[PDB]
Design a protein around this ligand. Structure first.
Ligand SMILES: Nc1nc2ncc(COP(=O)(O)O)nc2c(=O)[nH]1
Ligand SMILES: Nc1nc2ncc(COP(=O)(O)O)nc2c(=O)[nH]1
Ligand SMILES: [Mg+2]
Ligand SMILES: [Mg+2]
Lengths: 256, 256
């Protein structure tokens, strides 16, 4: 079984990969629709003034909500309001209070991989000698860090952080070696949904990138392959598409 | 490499799985767009008065056209007009003149599997004891038939005929055992695109089937899995979607 984590961007952002639900009610509506479509987790990302109210209503609607934040304070607020998981793009590195909070709360923590050369250059891609190996080592160190803080390992989730200070080539390399990360025995979450690499993969005849909205099929296919290779879950914008993919894989793979 | 065969239904049909391009120019436009999207073959299906003109223009535009017909006469007309492949849903069983025509023409021939209990009940699903094994045996016999007619085996293509006198369960069984059919050493074409089984797989909460247009992601995923398991090609309505899927598989599987 593969978990489907639907993305709910509560920020307003011109460059967004997938819908801006700044408006409380649209956002809530969107979260609900995603759960209805099969998402077992709704990942709300914003700061507190915007996300809290969304997290609160969704949690009140029985939805399993993840808070996508690098700040322990926003996380704590999220938790106080019904969130059941913390999704940290910094893998605990941005906020020293994060681990202790997770140790206090005992809820799942996603440690996403994001190793920048420097703090002022978080998006410059890192020149990796062996991205798979480096990413793995980095993640295991982040696990050690979390554990040392009192977090039960069983609550941890690894995420290779596709496209974060990584090229499309690094991305493909990580996916190809997905089974090696899965082999760490710690659940792996894949977040490729609508990312740049897909825009590039699917560029038009001209050389113009496929629009964000046109990257869902590719995203869905990455979900099926992820499922085939043991991933724990997938983080996506178009829930239906990835759920459809999963149903196919299961129907195919289970056909006696 | 997996061939992408785009569907061009030149009939008018209320129940169509995918667009009705009865109008010469729309049809042509559609065929061209499919080639542009990456389809290496455009499968025109109608009778002669409707398909011929489409086949002729497409072939004049350099497109590799397949004629989807059970009639040797329509096929011959198609060939006279530029078609380069014959797609026969009857596997040569509807028209005794078909094999000799293919032996004369020396172009690829798709032998689709479609075993009905009877002629008057072509759509009643056959009660199979072992669909995979029966389908295989049937196809190999159709190969023998074609060969005996002077057709070079190298020109043959097998197609399990998904959903033709088959249940969704049979369909899934055939796909799961795709590698066994691939092992015949004869190229295999998969035609699952938007079929009923997918409508059922993806039925809504209510129990209402997913609309035809909503079956493309599933179709695309079947394309990726087919690619992974050695299929020769896929026959689809939404070319972009299946091409996208193929690009993903290749990027993933080739990531050193
Ligand atoms: N755990 C995890 N969290 C994330 N949060 C935001 C984005 C970028 O998302 P966007 O495409 O909505 O901007 N990507 C990830 C990711 O890949 N993994
Ligand atoms: N070779 C082959 N030919 C076919 N022709 C028509 C349909 C039904 O197609 P539609 O969905 O456009 O009605 N299916 C096949 C098929 O599965 N394989
Ligand atoms: Mg987004
Ligand atoms: Mg059709």
């Amino acid at each position: 079984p593969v978990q489907v984590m639907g993305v709910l961007n509560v920020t307003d952002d011109s460059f967004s990969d997938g819908g801006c639900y700044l408006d409380l009610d649209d956002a809530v509506k969107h979260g609900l629709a995603m759960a209805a479509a099969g998402a077992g987790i709704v990942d709300v990302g914003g700061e507190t003034s915007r996300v809290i109210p969304v997290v609160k209503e969704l949690a009140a609607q029985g939805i399993t909500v993840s808070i996508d934040t690098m700040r322990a304070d926003v996380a704590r607020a999220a938790l106080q309001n019904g969130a059941q998981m913390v999704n940290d793009v910094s893998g605990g590195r941005a906020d020293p209070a994060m681990g202790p909070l997770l140790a206090e709360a005992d809820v799942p923590w996603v440690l996403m991989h994001w190793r920048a050369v420097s703090a002022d250059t978080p998006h410059v891609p890192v020149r990796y000698g062996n991205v798979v190996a480096e990413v793995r080592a980095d993640l295991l160190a982040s696990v050690a860090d979390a554990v040392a803080a009192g977090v039960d390992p069983a609550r941890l989730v690894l995420d290779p952080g596709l496209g974060f200070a990584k090229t499309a080539q690094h991305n493909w390399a990580i996916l190809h070696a997905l089974p090696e990360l899965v082999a760490t025995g710690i659940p792996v979450l894949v977040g490729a949904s609508r990312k740049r690499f897909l825009g590039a993969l699917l560029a038009g005849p001209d050389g113009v990138m496929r629009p964000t909205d046109g990257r869902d099929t590719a995203t869905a296919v990455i979900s099926a392959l992820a499922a085939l290779h043991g991933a724990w879950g997938v983080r996506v914008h178009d829930v239906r598409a990835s759920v459809d993919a999963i149903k196919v894989v299961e129907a195919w793979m289970g056909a006696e």
